Design a protein around this ligand. Structure first.
Ligand SMILES: Cc1ncc(COP(=O)(O)O)c(C=O)c1O
Ligand SMILES: Cc1ncc(COP(=O)(O)O)c(C=O)c1O
Lengths: 399, 399
């Protein structure tokens, strides 16, 4: 017969993971990886946090069974997740307006939400920032939802174009979904101020949007509580919203796939009715989530001694990135860059829009073995005191 | 504005997992759970295998990072999976005709296959046995694939209705997917003989079906190699096929979500092209799979010492279930059953298709605290020397 796989077309390279494959195969010893968002320590390693090793040790000696978790995962994991997102004494929690499912990573939480909406509501369009995480469009298209873009970044002044953002979103109709980065906007690193959040929250309720918050970097901007102010302004004003969160990065648990999808509705009867369909969409996907990574997170967040250790480790990560931002800017000037890169100090999180062209990013990789994303996004957390000088010499050589 | 979640219809109760929730709530003492397919030991517990504990200690001591796995997971995990399925010296492997993706459980493997087929092929129809695992239809429907049923079980002789199976698949077109259970058919426990497998393999190639094997219980019928005879009869004749396999049960790693989706095509260049689109379907779902569970399996299968331990543990599990099958039939007679349950001994795996009616199943639960699936499926692996007598007295009471 003809053959079913014979005419399949090869898939294009992932703009992020394809770069990581090239880096791994590169044989040059001085190669530098500033692509995929991984936290490196001063020594260039990607370590397991001490709080995580201690929690895994507890699990190894106390686990007696591997029997399936519920569709929505470990209950304590869900409860602790809502506390982090909304606060200890939140009204959503007391009113029982929120339900949380443990998911395989933030990516898994985005697909679950996308499947949930495409199959149980009349949602048709998702509004995503321009630029944004490249995988956002793929997740929502694969679920059958259209993806529209709204303006965000002023490339001239390296700032948030709040006028163009609101003008773009005026085309978003009621019932549409609008995606917001909770903090540390990927890839620009520019987040709204609290006042700008409150403006979007009020505009969101009067326009009829369904907010969808992507929360992959809580604690990397200013702090655990501070980074959730934007979400908590929306939460104090909307009847419905969705939060897809990730523990991959603030716990360094990338490959264990630890995330959550939290559903908020007007009242407890509606959220439970909606959550039953979300569990059905999970059942038809991976059935139940992996336990190891979420058990680690739950063990840490529920033990005051481990949590204290983890909160300090997260502070050290946040502050090392800030030190590298300063060192990055100073070193560029020291190596002969005549452009002003001071805007990089004002950006939060792991990434920064360097302003380099696709052709310059290509030169960096081929000629100097410095790997950045074609959009000019660089992982500041991949910079160390040892690789800063060769890295900045290469950037100056291509300007 | 009117809420987006108001017109959502509540999802029905899951036929398997909704049962486990009723069991956890039942306050009556002596309740017995013969529902969800978990392996219990002689004492009524769901333990962690010794080999799994050994492997987990090795990972705790030697893991230095939680860096993301590739989209397709741990390479060694895929190689050992192919050896398990096809044999150490298979032509499929030497010709490099197979590619394997690590997935979250067999469920995740099935969903990945469904998404891959729906988006990259002209497949529109999947044929599933009647009866089958209830979640099969949900997974393929989630991708928009039509699911048709073919006849399988002779509920009169308690055997494979091979004549009806052949006739009911007459309308299966070339390019349709036909789903086969590799061994330990769920729920009936009746598998095709080697001669019947070979007959199906010949018919499958003549009609141009795309075979999809669900392999969740390798090693629970007769043995690791013996249980794969049917798959290898198909593999020797077909240019293309798909295998969703699970390690949830033969390793007791249920909640770590350890599975694999294997893709087989005519040649190495074709499978590579097709596999790139499978990875794209994974990227738009959970991005990359969880490491812990698959790392355990790869460690055991690669270490000669641990593998010998695991194989003996799998033999112990298989043999206890077979003794419980014999004891179940003997005790039913002892307790006054006039219906002949000898067919139980001929069935393979954890599950016994008892032939009880939905009314009798509901009566066992509400009246005696014995929990089985409404189809009459009972988990033999949940029977113990301590609960056998009350269980059989309950059944006899409703016959
Ligand atoms: C904005 C954003 N959303 C989602 C994700 C996915 O996170 P995870 O690795 O937990 O799937 C990432 C990074 O991976 C991200 O930067
Ligand atoms: C036939 C069959 N396929 C797939 C599965 C799913 O297994 P997993 O837990 O790996 O998702 C099961 C049981 O759970 C099964 O019986």
């Amino acid at each position: 017969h003809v053959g079913t796989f014979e005419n399949i077309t090869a898939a294009p390279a992932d703009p992020i993971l394809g770069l990581a494959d090239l880096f791994r195969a590169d044989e040059r010893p001085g190669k530098i990886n500033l692509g995929i968002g991984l936290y490196y320590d001063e020594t260039g390693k990607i370590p397991v946090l001490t709080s995580v090793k201690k929690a895994e040790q507890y699990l190894l000696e106390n686990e007696t069974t591997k029997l399936y978790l519920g569709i929505d995962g470990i209950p304590e994991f869900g409860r602790c997740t809502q506390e982090l997102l909304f606060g200890k004494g939140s009204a959503l929690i007391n009113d029982k307006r929120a339900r949380t499912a443990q998911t395989p990573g933030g990516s898994g939480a985005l697909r679950v939400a996308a499947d949930f909406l495409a199959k149980n509501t009349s949602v048709k369009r998702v509004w995503v920032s321009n630029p944004s995480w490249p995988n956002h469009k793929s997740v929502f298209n694969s679920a059958g939802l259209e993806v529209r873009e709204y303006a965000y970044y002023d490339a001239e002044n390296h700032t948030l174009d709040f006028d163009a953002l609101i003008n773009s979103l005026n085309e978003a109709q009621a019932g549409d979904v609008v995606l917001f980065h909770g903090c540390c906007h990927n890839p620009t690193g520019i987040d709204p101020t609290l006042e700008q959040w409150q403006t979007l929250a009020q505009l969101s309720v009067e326009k009829g949007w369904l907010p969808l918050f992507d929360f992959a970097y809580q604690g990397f901007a200013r702090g655990l509580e501070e980074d959730a102010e934007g979400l908590r302004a929306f939460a104090a004003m909307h009847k419905e919203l969705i939060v897809a969160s990730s523990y991959s990065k603030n716990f360094g648990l990338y490959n264990e796939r630890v995330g959550a999808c939290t559903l908020v509705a007007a009242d407890s009867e509606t959220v439970d009715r909606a959550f039953s369909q979300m569990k059905a969409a999970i059942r038809a996907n991976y059935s139940s989530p992996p336990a190891h990574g979420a058990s680690v997170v739950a063990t840490i967040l529920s033990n005051d001694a481990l949590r204290a250790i983890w909160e300090q480790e997260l502070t050290d990560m946040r502050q090392r990135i800030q030190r590298m931002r300063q060192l990055f800017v100073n070193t560029l000037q020291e190596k002969g860059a005549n452009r002003d890169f001071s805007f990089i100090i004002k950006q939060n999180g792991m990434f920064s829009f360097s302003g380099l062209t696709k052709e310059q990013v290509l030169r960096l990789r081929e000629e100097f073995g410095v790997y950045a994303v074609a959009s000019g996004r660089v992982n500041v957390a991949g910079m160390t005191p040892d690789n800063m000088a060769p890295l900045c010499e290469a950037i100056v050589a291509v300007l």
